[PDB]
Scaffold this motif. Structure first.
Motif, PDB file in Angstrom:
ATOM      1  N   UNK A 202       0.833  -1.199   0.000  1.00  0.00           N
ATOM      2  CA  UNK A 202       0.000   0.000   0.000  1.00  0.00           C
ATOM      3  C   UNK A 202       0.875   1.259   0.000  1.00  0.00           C
ATOM      4  N   UNK A 203       0.480   2.240  -0.804  1.00  0.00           N
ATOM      5  CA  UNK A 203       1.169   3.526  -0.881  1.00  0.00           C
ATOM      6  C   UNK A 203       0.361   4.576  -0.116  1.00  0.00           C
TER       7      UNK A 203
ATOM      8  N   UNK B 291      -4.300   2.712  -3.246  1.00  0.00           N
ATOM      9  CA  UNK B 291      -3.368   2.645  -4.364  1.00  0.00           C
ATOM     10  C   UNK B 291      -2.195   1.715  -4.027  1.00  0.00           C
ATOM     11  N   UNK B 292      -1.956   0.726  -4.878  1.00  0.00           N
ATOM     12  CA  UNK B 292      -1.162  -0.434  -4.499  1.00  0.00           C
ATOM     13  C   UNK B 292       0.006  -0.693  -5.432  1.00  0.00           C
TER      14      UNK B 292
ATOM     15  N   UNK C 180       2.421   0.611  -9.972  1.00  0.00           N
ATOM     16  CA  UNK C 180       1.370   1.113  -9.073  1.00  0.00           C
ATOM     17  C   UNK C 180      -0.037   0.917  -9.666  1.00  0.00           C
ATOM     18  N   UNK C 181      -0.985   0.476  -8.836  1.00  0.00           N
ATOM     19  CA  UNK C 181      -2.390   0.327  -9.249  1.00  0.00           C
ATOM     20  C   UNK C 181      -3.388   0.908  -8.260  1.00  0.00           C
TER      21      UNK C 181
END
Lengths: 390, 390, 150
Positions: free
Chosen positions: C5-6, C35-36, C42-43
């Protein structure tokens, strides 16, 4: 005025004292109880097996003060009955009732010797429930055991045995129905004893909740069959788990607990007709009551070196050994031909008669080989060992 | 031959099992007992409040093995009764007797499930005494509670409840008369519960020794009134200590203990006619059963700042104070509007709302003054303190 | 799993225990924008909060009667049975649909709803037949017992 004396008078001498002496192999003990005369000419007398147990001498005392030495014809503990003979003559009896005509609410008199007396004690009540006991609120205390439970016309309909209760009468006593009594009496009289048989069935009570749940009216009645062991007469006859037993020979089955009581009276060799609803279809089955010694003995010569074990397949990386592939012993009958040669639970049988042992079947095909011994190779944690199973 | 089966047969399914599960707020518990079907169409069932108490689930089991989930319509503990409903149909009952036709010596059968069974246990005896219990020597043990006590023609005449006796039957059991049962059943059924009322009477048994001592034949019969509390319905109606209650509405009074049992069945709001011999003159009185919450609540707004106290006049030379003149608190209801503001027993109220407080009446006339608070000034041994009573 | 996780919604996430603190504050119905990081890519994701007790219900629903019980294939040669095959019940929740119905951990379910049980799947297949009840045929030691699970 109403009275119970007119009938009790004629029938009291039919009931006797039974005192018993001896010692328990696990101490001296005196064990007092009661008894009934069912064959005035041959001196055949009934009592509870628990009274006469561990007796050396069995002293009976009739009403007329005659103290007689008694002999144990035979006595089954599983029904807790015993037949007795006495060589005196001039003995009286009473008529033997039919326990099946009895109805909850019938009046009833118990005859016996609770605590001391030497002539006898009689007590009144009704029939309170039918089970395989008869329940009565007519008083029954220590010493009543083996004595008579007679109906409102004085016919032997029961032999009083137990109380529920620091145990006084409390109003809940138990007698065996007389029909059962005749049944075990002649068998013991005749064959001198009772050979009980095996079936290979396990049976549970059919809740309406269940009946319905198996596609049946919630007032369908019978005994649900939960298991049928293999190579058991039950299975030979062609029974199956799931079946609902509705009827056994003559008897009609409305409770599970009935099945056990109908059957555990059958001599080895007895055929037993079993009517059994299966998937809404009715199918009559016949099974043979066989010998519990020979049957055990048979499976033993059937499955020879492996009887008494509980096996499973095993595949594990195990230091120090590497990758273990054998069968895993998950238990062992302590009197098994396995256990005796050394096999303990937990062992991994990775070999037999110098062949690789992979799955349970791989091991069984090896015990198949006709010989006098199985040479087995086991692991036992960090170390191994060969064991010769005879 | 005589028998009780002909009637018991038709009526057994009317009696049921009642098993109960849950936990007590002071632990898990299973609590087994009995029950009776008094409305086969609506499934109305009776039992003892003590069985079903603290239940989450109430499982009933009829004779046909049907295990039903039950619901508690309502249940009064003071009479130890509870009404139950079950949503199954095809239910049987029995006729509801009239407990007032019963006579000591009547034959009688108790139906219930003492200890285990799942169909039911029946036991015989006579009616041994009438009290508000029925006494019987028909056996009653743990599990009989909630079950039926029926007469020699099979009509529900009682609900068995308690034993006297480390507690086996011993031959002394207690059932509530059925008349009472109907009475509490509809009230609970209807209003969903029972609102008990107050009277303000205390009543003692009229010994002939007493009757005579108040100028009466030593076989005059009734309940002596020892007190009538003030502003209590008993006093509104115009009752008085000394009076002998001879008759309440319908019921005829021959013992004291009757008065309490006739009345503690009356809904709040009930009129009750009280016939009462007074100084050899008979005078009918009418009293209203009122609400025990509101009534308390009323005296509280009546006597406002002073309710819950016990006062007295006080005049003492007391170091350090000199000559003390106030009212003396001789006790205090811990939930009283007094006690909460600080007043403890022993205190001397020597002043209130800055006026001198001499005798109990001097203090009451001051609490008379319409305000939101009483400003009270107390002594407490060697020291004083002001306290604001709201 | 393996995601990093961001950030949650707007709030950027620099520590592991940031997350639990961030969430428990969020009101149920909210729409979190997680956002992962997945393999340096990144997604951005959309997920919706829900209630604990409400959730548990979803778990009880999606699986009718087998809820609360751990299960694994079983095969053993076991007196007096012969060669048993079924799924063994490892664990049975104190408040599992089966524990109520009479099941205890240890039991070996040889048949359900009149059909033979073998692998773990077969039992669920059977447990998806659109029914009011599950009739489970258990083994307990040298003994058998039928149970109606509801």
């Amino acid at each position: 005025m109403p009275s119970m004396a007119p009938v009790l008078k004629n029938i009291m001498p039919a009931i006797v004292n039974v005192a018993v002496q001896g010692y328990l192999p696990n101490r001296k003990f005196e064990s007092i109880g009661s008894g009934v005369i069912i064959d005035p000419n041959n001196g055949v007398i009934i009592t509870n097996d628990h009274v006469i147990r561990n007796a050396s001498l069995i002293t009976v005392t009739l009403q007329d003060g005659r103290r007689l030495k008694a002999r144990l014809i035979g006595g089954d503990s599983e029904t807790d009955l015993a037949v007795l003979k006495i060589d005196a003559k001039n003995l009286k009896s009473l008529v033997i009732g039919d326990s099946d005509k009895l109805e909850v609410g019938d009046f009833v008199v118990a005859i016996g010797n609770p605590f001391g007396l030497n002539s006898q004690s009689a007590t009144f009540g009704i029939v309170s429930a039918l089970k395989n006991f008869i329940q009565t609120d007519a008083a029954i205390n220590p010493g009543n055991a083996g004595g008579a439970l007679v109906n409102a016309k004085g016919e032997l309909i029961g032999i009083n045995t137990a109380i529920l209760s620091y145990g006084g009468n409390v109003g809940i006593g138990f007698a065996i129905p007389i029909n059962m009594v005749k049944d075990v009496a002649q068998q013991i009289i005749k064959f001198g004893s009772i050979h009980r048989g095996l079936m290979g069935i396990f049976v549970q009570h059919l809740t309406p909740e269940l009946a319905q749940a198996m596609g049946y009216p919630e007032d369908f009645q019978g005994a649900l069959v939960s298991q049928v062991n293999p190579n058991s007469p039950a299975e030979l006859a062609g029974l199956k788990a799931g079946d609902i037993i509705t009827q056994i020979n003559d008897t009609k089955i409305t409770q599970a607990t009935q099945v056990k009581t109908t059957i555990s009276l059958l001599r080895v060799g007895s055929t037993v007709k079993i009517i059994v609803e299966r998937d809404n279809k009715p199918l009559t089955l016949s099974a043979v009551v066989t010998d519990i010694k020979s049957h055990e003995q048979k499976l033993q010569s059937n499955n020879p070196f492996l009887y008494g074990l509980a096996l499973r397949a095993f595949e594990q990386e195990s230091p120090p050994h590497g990758n273990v592939i054998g069968v895993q012993v998950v238990g062992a009958s302590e009197n098994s031909a396995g256990w005796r040669a050394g096999i303990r639970p937990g062992d991994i049988i990775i070999s037999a008669n110098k062949k690789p042992v992979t799955d349970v079947k791989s091991l069984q095909t090896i015990a198949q080989e006709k010989k006098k011994e199985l040479l087995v190779q086991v692991l036992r944690g960090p170390g191994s060992m060969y064991l010769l199973v005879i």
